[PDB]
Design a protein around this ligand. Structure first.
Ligand SMILES: [Ca+2]
Ligand SMILES: [Ca+2]
Ligand SMILES: [Ca+2]
Ligand SMILES: [Ca+2]
Ligand SMILES: [Ca+2]
Ligand SMILES: [Ca+2]
Ligand SMILES: [Ca+2]
Ligand SMILES: [Ca+2]
Ligand SMILES: [Ca+2]
Ligand SMILES: [Ca+2]
Ligand SMILES: [Cl-]
Ligand SMILES: [Mg+2]
Length: 1394
């Protein structure tokens, strides 16, 4: 034919045609695209001449599938020769959106091959139009736990069926190169060895803080490159913006003759919120407009109010809505805001509170339309046009940057990802932006460089080939120059440069540093950079090249102290010439003294800076052919040791500074707990004098207190300092303190320790958090990404490693951690901390009867916290009672507080009491310390009845209004009883208040469920009332410890047979960790009056699993619904001991109710019970106001675990239907568990079941007809847990077994870090390994940034550092370590010679 022309907007730039014209189009290669969707009907989806393809027919395929075990997924046509949906286990591979399919677009880019024209009039091709496509539909739901296993099957399938390259969009911000998820890394190594190029988008988060503000110059570790592409084997791809852009434009023909404005044709950007221009003004219809100066009202009133689309420049003060709305007010019809900054890329507003005028941003100050001076006409194109782009040849804003988390240079290379036009569904095309557009450009190009290498170097093995495909692509790339600043683009942003395909299949040169890689990561840099660059020549003629090295660093806006993410050029240090043998290599030695720049740069980057850049090679004769180059980066400083956390908001405020994400709005020194800072947090709860407080107040920043307005304020003591103090007394007011961090770098090994503050060197921990934590920097790339993280696992509560109470005193609470670089130093951060459990001093005061002046003694605390506030209040009666009860009808919540009203405090320290407003003696005086201890005297308590007189001295004592609740006792012990006691409470069903609990005897069913639900949470011992129990100890022993010799929890000193709490075991170790389900020996020992030793032994069982309610039966009897639950079994620890049917009656409009008992207020569900009939049915009756979803069935096991279901939910099961439920069986507490996993159920022929119905609102419980089935575990968090039982389980539903329980038994995974640190660098030829318990070797390799150190992350276990060592050498030091979970273990080892 005479075919439409090809769009070379991208090919001209990346120089594709230099490869096409040498016969490299992808013919007989295959790209495996792992991604979201694909339409293989698309006209683009085409091969020319199947005869030359890798796979020549639908049968060549079924011949490849069975060949390697793939029993699933079809061949579709000559182009898309394999496709399987790995999420469903489906062959539904096409997405259904607005034709907008991501994976469609990606495939268009790598291998589109259309003959037809898109809407421009051109036809579009990929980099490899003649390559074949296998598509793996693979994508992630949170609901899975980990989609990784799916990606690995797609990778392994792709390899097996014979791909040449794989294209992944997959990414996890702040990847490491050496420690990504190992199952996925190894899958990738496996493709490399099969000669597969693994090409991965680098991510779209850009850099730390990117949704907030540019990064502080004290924080150079701002990189965020993706978790798989950051690995050494993949090719990791950054994105540049296309120079040409295909969009609907706007045209004023009255500006046709301005050729620098694309002939009167503008790029307009409406806000992502609204986008109302097409639907409100309509394409292809012409409208008036009128320049408005000044978006006030003045500006010629409203000339642009008749029909004119209003045209206004941006007022950087007035907001986008103060503008659109003010225009719509004057009659707008729709407004254009044209940019105030000249030459700038159309700011993105979003901004849509009060739009409704149909608005857009017109390109720049440029495109100020001033024809006939304000008046003009304009229309909106309905078809897309080619336009110069307002941001072409710029790095795309969001391409990931920086180094990998562990210090390596990535990404590797750049390609066009901004505004790329490619294929959508249903013969549509569209344009779309991101680093995963750039990635298929490079996937395509490595198709072609592979074709080449295969023709031109046929003696290259599978294993070596993908690594050379990469090294050519990089080394031949065009080093990009930032156009706004005229400086080389950072290699941390652009990699080895912009893609140059021709260069790569033409020059036959590539470059390599010492590490045999197309880029160079030097580690730390010290006043002298020396390194070895190596050029390689695949030609059999030869090349002579002249070279020179440009050295860069990061520019810093000195007004702001923030990186600008642009590079400044230091010095193009000069090189030389060298000649590169045919089929050989030559090595040159670059050397630069940078001593010169240290002072100027250390001044603006006090924690160090990057020294990076390129080494350029040109042909010595003609400097435009044989252009190749290598990137490098080092760190002037100690990259491994950069601060991991931002400094504490305390220290920063104290030195006039602020947090990177800290919102300083509000009253001076407000630290509301929802802001973002490093700090400590604690729980508060109010003190009430007229009723028992029934709920706490939530977390607040420790050291802050509500001021009059209820904002929480960092108060200072007399010396002008905040006070970090907790009062671990049981009252839930500041009883604990926990670390909250704003993390700057990825952290690992994080724990909390408490030392006595006179233990200055932190050598004797008194308490350590039971676990250790690890996590990500708070990079905040958009709203979904936390600006701070709270680690409640670091809660300290004044108990020690033993559970003993640590005395009131002055301690250091030390949070320690490590960055993710081997060899780094442990970073501590210290909080001075008071343990004070003592209320302030209530002495006496001077009341004078006619000045009405109450003045108390000056304020004195007991303990170190210090008095913080002085108060007087009375209880204003209201609805006749001194407190108000408040029922949050929507959250089903009740709260109660005093009607406290406060008397102002005159500056001299006293109070003028309003006795018009209540009696003296109904006023309370209150003194609070900084730890939360609260003293309150009711001053009437010590009033003389001689009221009116002359000034009297009044005695004040505390009323113990702030105390810890205590549990209702009521119990009388006979000698019959065991001695054991536990607690009893019902489970709320509607209200979310804490149900009333009270003590109960325990003379059977020795089983507890430590879940803090009120019911059987502990085992305490209570003695006969007149018996004596001297020296009373409880110890708990594991079942292994049959000699009862090493306790795992013991009563603290001073426990007594009648203080129950002192004796209560809550299934917890001495450290306060929940014990595992199992049996334990609870041993009570005491001496009586006579000194005879007594011991009472009991076997307690711990188990907190909720019971599983099965669907029962329903029958109609005398016209009334009858419910018959299935027979519960009673076989111990889980057997049912309580069975209820009830319903909730509405009263006062709701289903719960408040009752004002003698102590205080209590909340209950309006429960009404249904007698069990003698046939085991319950009669579910008529009852005005009550529907079947108001009737419940409830069960309790011997442990006190409770479950319930509405009868509506149980009745949704047909009478012929059965129910199967799937779950995981982990040997840990319910709060320590995965719940996330997906599964496939197949019917008796192997067909996936369709049209799912769920049982009792659980997506792990299905309603199915009777039959044979199988279930297969699809996904689960494989970093957290290992499957142990069968992955496929067969089961049969039937009217007898109409409820099946299928569980996948699992074990749980725990890692540790090990670092071996040496004295002096080890001699050449030494090898370091970890030797495992079974005798195997785990090789370690030198740390880049810390070369005396070798480390790895391992499975929790016992290891020994073995070292191989030549000549006469020896290692001394402890080489053995028993790792702990999430811990970091350092072995300092010593190298010795003679
Ligand atoms: Ca196409
Ligand atoms: Ca408080
Ligand atoms: Ca307290
Ligand atoms: Ca070390
Ligand atoms: Ca105190
Ligand atoms: Ca107060
Ligand atoms: Ca319980
Ligand atoms: Ca289906
Ligand atoms: Ca160092
Ligand atoms: Ca463990
Ligand atoms: Cl922004
Ligand atoms: Mg912005």
């Amino acid at each position: 034919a005479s075919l439409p022309p090809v769009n070379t907007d991208i090919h001209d730039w990346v120089k594709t045609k230099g490869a096409w014209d040498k016969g490299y189009k992808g013919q007989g290669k295959v790209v495996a695209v792992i991604d979201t969707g694909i339409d293989p009907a698309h006209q683009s989806m085409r091969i020319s001449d199947v005869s030359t393809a890798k796979v020549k027919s639908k049968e060549d395929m079924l011949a490849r599938q069975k060949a390697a075990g793939i029993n699933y997924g079809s061949w579709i046509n000559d182009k898309v020769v394999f496709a399987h949906n790995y999420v469903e286990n489906s062959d539904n591979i096409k997405e259904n959106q607005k034709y907008e399919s991501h994976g469609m677009h990606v495939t268009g880019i790598v291998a589109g091959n259309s003959k037809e024209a898109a809407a421009t009039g051109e036809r579009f091709l990929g980099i490899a139009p003649e390559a074949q496509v296998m598509f793996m539909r693979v994508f992630a739901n949170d609901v899975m736990g980990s989609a990784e296993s799916l990606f690995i099957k797609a990778i392994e399938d792709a390899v097996a069926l014979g791909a040449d390259v794989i294209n992944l969009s997959l990414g996890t911000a702040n990847g490491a190169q050496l420690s990504g998820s190992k199952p996925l890394m190894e899958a990738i190594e496996k493709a490399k060895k099969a000669g597969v190029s693994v090409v991965v988008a680098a991510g779209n988060e850009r850099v730390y803080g990117s949704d907030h503000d540019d990064p502080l110059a004290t924080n150079p570790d701002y990189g965020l490159v993706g978790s798989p592409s950051t690995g050494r084997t993949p090719t990791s791809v950054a994105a540049i913006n296309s120079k040409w852009v295909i969009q609907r434009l706007m045209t004023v023909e009255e500006l046709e003759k301005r050729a620098d404005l694309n002939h009167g044709k503008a790029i307009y950007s409406e806000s992502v919120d609204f986008k109302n221009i097409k639907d409100s003004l309509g394409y292809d219809k012409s409208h008036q407009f009128a320049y408005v100066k000044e978006s006030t009202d003045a500006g010629y009133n409203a000339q642009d109010v008749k029909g004119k689309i209003a045209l206004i420049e941006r007022d950087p003060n007035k907001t986008y809505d103060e503008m659109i709305a003010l225009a719509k007010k004057h009659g707008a019809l729709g407004v254009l805001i044209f940019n105030n900054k000249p030459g700038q890329s159309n700011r993105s507003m979003n901004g849509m509170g009060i739009p409704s005028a149909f608005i857009s941003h017109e390109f720049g100050k440029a495109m100020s339309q001033l024809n006939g001076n304000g008046t003009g006409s304009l229309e909106f194109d309905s078809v897309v046009s080619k336009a110069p782009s307002q941001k072409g040849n710029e790095m795309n804003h969001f391409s990931n940057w920086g180094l990998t988390s562990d210090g390596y240079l990535k990404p590797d290379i750049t390609a066009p990802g901004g505004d790329i036009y490619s294929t959508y569904n249903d013969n549509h095309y569209g344009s779309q932006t991101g680093t995963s557009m750039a990635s298929p450009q490079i996937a395509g190009a490595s198709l072609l460089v592979k074709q080449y290498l295969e023709k031109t170097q046929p003696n290259l093995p599978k294993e070596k080939i993908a690594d050379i495909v990469k090294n050519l692509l990089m080394s031949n790339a065009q080093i990009h120059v930032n156009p706004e600043t005229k400086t080389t683009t950072s290699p941390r942003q652009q990699g080895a440069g912009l893609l140059n395909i021709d260069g790569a299949v033409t020059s036959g040169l590539y470059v390599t540093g010492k590490d045999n890689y197309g880029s160079i990561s030097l580690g730390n840099i010290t006043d002298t950079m020396t390194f070895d660059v190596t050029v390689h020549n695949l030609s059999n003629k030869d090349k002579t090249l002249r070279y020179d090295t440009e050295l860069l660093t990061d520019h810093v806006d000195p007004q702001k102290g923030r990186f600008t993410l642009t590079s400044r050029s230091l010095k193009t240090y000069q090189g030389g010439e060298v000649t590169v043998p045919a089929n050989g290599k030559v090595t040159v030695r670059v050397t630069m003294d940078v001593s010169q720049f240290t002072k100027e740069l250390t001044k603006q980057m006090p924690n160090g800076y990057y020294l990076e850049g390129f080494v350029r090679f040109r042909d010595s004769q003609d400097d435009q052919l044989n252009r190749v180059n290598i990137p490098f980066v080092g760190f002037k400083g100690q990259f491994e040791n950069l601060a991991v956390a931002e400094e504490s908001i305390y220290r920063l405020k104290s030195q006039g500074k602020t947090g990177f994400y800290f919102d300083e709005s509000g009253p001076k020194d407000d630290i509301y707990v929802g802001k973002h800072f490093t700090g400590l947090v604690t729980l508060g709860s109010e003190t009430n004098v007229s009723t028992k407080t029934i709920s706490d107040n939530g977390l607040h920043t420790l050291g802050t207190f509500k001021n009059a307005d209820g904002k929480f304020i960092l108060e200072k003591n007399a010396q002008g300092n905040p006070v970090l103090a907790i009062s671990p007394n049981g009252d839930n007011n500041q009883d604990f303190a926990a670390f909250k961090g704003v993390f700057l770098r990825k952290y690992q090994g994080l724990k909390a320790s408490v030392y006595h503050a006179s233990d200055k060197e932190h050598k004797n921990p008194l308490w350590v958090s039971p676990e250790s934590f690890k996590g990500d920097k708070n990079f905040n790339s958009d709203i979904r990404f936390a600006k701070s993280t709270t680690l409640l696992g670091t809660a300290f509560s004044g108990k020690s490693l033993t559970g003993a109470e640590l005395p009131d005193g002055y301690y250091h609470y030390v949070v320690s951690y490590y960055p993710d670089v081997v060899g780094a130093k442990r970073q501590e951060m210290t909080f001075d901390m008071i343990l004070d459990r003592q209320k302030p001093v209530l002495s006496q005061a001077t009341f004078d009867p006619e000045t009405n002046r109450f003045k108390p003694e000056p304020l004195k605390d007991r303990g170190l916290a210090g008095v913080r506030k002085d108060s007087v209040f009375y209880l204003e009666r209201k609805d006749n009672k001194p407190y108000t009860v408040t029922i949050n009808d929507s959250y089903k919540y009740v709260s109660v507080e005093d009607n406290k009203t406060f008397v102002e405090r005159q500056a001299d320290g006293s109070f003028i009491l309003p006795l018009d407003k209540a009696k003296l003696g109904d006023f309370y005086y209150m003194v609070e310390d900084f730890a939360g201890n609260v003293a309150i005297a009711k001053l009437g308590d010590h009033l003389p009845q001689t009221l009116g007189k002359t000034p009297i001295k009044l005695k004040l004592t505390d009323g113990n209004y702030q105390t810890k609740e205590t549990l209702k006792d009521n119990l009388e012990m006979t000698q019959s009883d065991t001695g054991l006691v536990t607690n009893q409470a019902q489970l709320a069903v509607v209200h979310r208040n804490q149900p009333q609990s009270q003590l109960t005897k325990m003379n059977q069913d020795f089983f507890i469920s430590p879940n803090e639900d009120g019911n059987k949470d502990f085992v305490a011992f209570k003695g006969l009332e007149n018996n004596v129990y001297n020296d009373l100890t409880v110890n708990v022993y594991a079942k292994d410890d049959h000699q009862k010799q090493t306790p795992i929890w013991s009563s603290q000193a001073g426990a007594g047979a009648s203080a129950i709490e002192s004796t209560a075991w809550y299934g917890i170790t001495a450290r306060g960790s929940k014990v595992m389900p199992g049996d334990y020996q609870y041993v009570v020992t005491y001496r009586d009056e006579h000194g005879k030793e007594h011991q009472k032994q009991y076997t307690i069982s711990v188990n907190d699993k909720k019971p599983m309610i099965t669907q029962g039966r329903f029958d109609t009897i005398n016209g009334v619904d009858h419910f018959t639950p299935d027979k519960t079994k009673a076989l111990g620890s889980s057997g049912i001991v309580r069975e209820e049917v009830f319903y909730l009656a509405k009263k006062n409009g709701r289903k719960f109710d408040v009752t004002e008992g003698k102590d205080g207020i209590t909340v209950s569900d309006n429960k009404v019970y249904i007698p069990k009939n003698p046939d085991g049915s319950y009669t579910i009756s008529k009852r005005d106001g009550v529907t079947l979803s108001d009737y419940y069935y409830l069960v309790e096991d011997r442990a006190g675990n409770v479950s319930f279901a509405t009868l509506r939910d149980l009745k949704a099961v047909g009478k012929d239907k059965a129910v199967v439920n799937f779950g995981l069986d982990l040997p840990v507490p319910e709060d320590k568990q995965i719940v996330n996993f997906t599964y496939l159920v197949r019917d008796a022929d192997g067909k996936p079941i369709e049209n799912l119905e769920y049982y009792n609102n659980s997506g792990n419980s299905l309603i199915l007809p009777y039959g044979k089935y199988t279930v297969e575990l699809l996904t689960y968090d494989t970093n957290a847990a290992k499957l142990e039982s069968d992955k496929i389980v067969s089961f049969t539903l039937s009217a007898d077994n109409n409820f099946q329980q299928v569980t996948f038994k699992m074990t749980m995974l725990a890692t540790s870090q090990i670092t071996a640190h040496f004295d002096h660098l080890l001699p050449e030829g030494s090898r370091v390994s970890l030797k495992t318990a079974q005798g195997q070797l785990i090789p370690l390799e030198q740390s880049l940034y810390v070369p005396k150190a070798y480390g790895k992350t391992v499975q929790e276990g016992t290891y020994e550092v073995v070292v191989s060592l030549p000549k006469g050498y020896r290692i001394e030091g402890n080489t053995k370590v028993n790792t702990l979970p999430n811990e970091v273990h350092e072995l300092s080892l010593r190298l010795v010679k003679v």
